[PDB]
Structures are given as C-alpha cells and as structure tokens.
C-alpha cells in the first residue's frame, strides 16, 4: 500500500516534518522524513527488517498512553524512512509557549511537569530512554491541556549500565557527561527534568556554559516558592546518586494537588 495514496501532504512544520491528513478518515498526522545517510543507531524489528532506532523506540512506547506522540505507520524508501505520527490541533510547543508567556505560574508548571513525569515513567516502563527532554521536545494540546513527548531520534533502549555516547542537547546534559563522557539513564533524565522545571518557573534554562553545568550553583532570577527551589536543586544535584527517583519527585511536597489536564486547559490555556 503506497504512502502517496494513503496520506495528503501539506506544508512544512520544521526540521524535515510536514503537516498531513490520512484520507481513510481525514485524521491530522505529521509526516517525518529521515535520510538513511544521517542515521547512526539502527535497530531490528521481529521481522528482522533493519530500521532506525527511532522506529524501534516509538513502537515500544506507542501502546495507547497519550503522553507520547504515537507512531501510526512507517515506510521505507531508497534513501529515507517516513514516519506517520499523530498531530494534535491546535498545538504549541512548550519552548514557544514559555517564550510568549514568560515564567509560568507554579500551578501551571506543576501540571505540565507532572504530565512530563508520567510520560517519562511510561517510556522507562516500556524500556525506552528519551535522552533529549527539553521544552522544544514537548507539545501542548491547548484544547485538552495534554503534554506529549516528541523526537526519540537521540533515544536508546533503557539499560542499568553506563552510557558513553550522547547526541542530545548539551545545555540539558548532566555534569558527569560534561566532565567524564559517562552517565546512567535515570539519573541523567532527572538532571534534564531539573533544567526543564527551572525553564518553566524562571522563563529560561539556568545554564548556557559547561562551567555553569559543573558549577553546582542555581540562582533564581524569578520569585519561586521554597518547595519548588528545593525540588529543582535536588534534581540538579552534582552527584547522580544524590538526585531523587521519579517516585521521590512525585512524592515531593511541591508536586501535591496537581490539576487534571482539562482543569489546566480551562484555567490557563482556553
């Protein structure tokens, strides 16, 4: 069944991802093109079919929990792969949302961060490590108030052993990566979630340079509650083993009394 018949292709979105529509029911989709010559990590499916790791990772997390953008279909071509993904509309990415709104109210940030935590727990439970958690890789469904993770292209199978490669965003990467070119998955994820939470409540990331990342100093440029400052500093512990678990984050006093997604939409997005 050809790709060119099953889907109607619209204009670009970024990069190489196009707006599109599935003919069999006019579903909004996103159509992502990846050049074979640019892929580093290759997985195998049950079929044995050699595919990009991104396809392997997306299939493991696309089980129906809505906190991740689901892969609906994919196709191989001579020099490229084509991924069919879901497209919420209306949608805005968290980077653009924070750029326009500035620093978020703790209540909104609490809802957003909670949903990211549930989505990352989902990936971990499915054996997938994202490795590029940042505002740019989070979509907001503005009507539903639901956050969705995108871009598993820097991703990996979750292991308990050390990682020595990283193609994610340097300013969200942990001090142990900067210093020693080594990290563990969970502990690095919690560091990047510390950067993301700072980003939400202060209106930008805390660190631009290697020195700041390894420095172990977090200055708040914005009024932030003591409980929120405490959680951020805990996620941004220099020693990986000093960082909280996903459990400890979600049991943290700052994380209590979270809004439902619809409540979040009604109060803050509509």
């Amino acid at each position: 069944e050809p790709l060119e018949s099953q889907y109607q292709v619209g204009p670009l979105l970024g990069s190489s991802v196009y707006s599109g529509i599935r003919v069999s029911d006019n579903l909004p989709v996103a159509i992502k093109h990846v050049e074979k010559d640019r892929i580093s990590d290759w997985g195998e499916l049950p079929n044995g079919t050699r595919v990009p790791m991104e396809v392997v990772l997306l299939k493991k997390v696309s089980s129906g929990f809505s906190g991740v953008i689901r892969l609906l279909d994919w196709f191989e071509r001579p020099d490229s792969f084509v991924l069919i993904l879901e497209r919420p509309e209306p949608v805005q990415d968290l980077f653009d949302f924070i750029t326009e709104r500035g620093a978020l109210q703790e209540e909104l940030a609490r809802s957003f961060f909670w949903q990211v935590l549930e989505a990352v727990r989902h990936c971990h439970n499915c054996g997938v490590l994202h490795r590029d958690i940042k505002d740019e890789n989070i979509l907001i469904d503005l009507n539903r108030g639901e956050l969705k993770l995108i871009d598993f292209g820097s991703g990996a199978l979750l292991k308990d052993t050390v990682y020595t490669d990283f193609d994610g965003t340097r300013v969200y990467s942990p001090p142990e990566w900067i210093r020693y070119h080594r990290y563990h998955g969970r502990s690095a994820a919690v560091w990047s979630l510390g950067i993301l939470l700072y980003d939400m409540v202060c209106g930008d990331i805390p660190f631009e340079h290697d020195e700041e990342i390894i420095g172990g100093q977090v200055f708040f440029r914005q009024r932030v509650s003591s409980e929120c400052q405490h959680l951020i500093r805990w996620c941004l512990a220099l020693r990986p083993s000093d960082r909280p678990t996903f459990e400890e984050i979600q049991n943290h006093p700052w994380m209590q009394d979270v809004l439902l997604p619809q409540e979040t939409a009604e109060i803050h997005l509509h």
Partner: peptide
C-alpha cells in the same frame, strides 16, 4: 540574556 533554541 537571549532566550534561544539549542541544537541536538
């Protein structure tokens, strides 16, 4: 103090 996207 320019807020900007960062490549991966």
């Amino acid at each position: 103090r320019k807020r900007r996207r960062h490549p991966s």
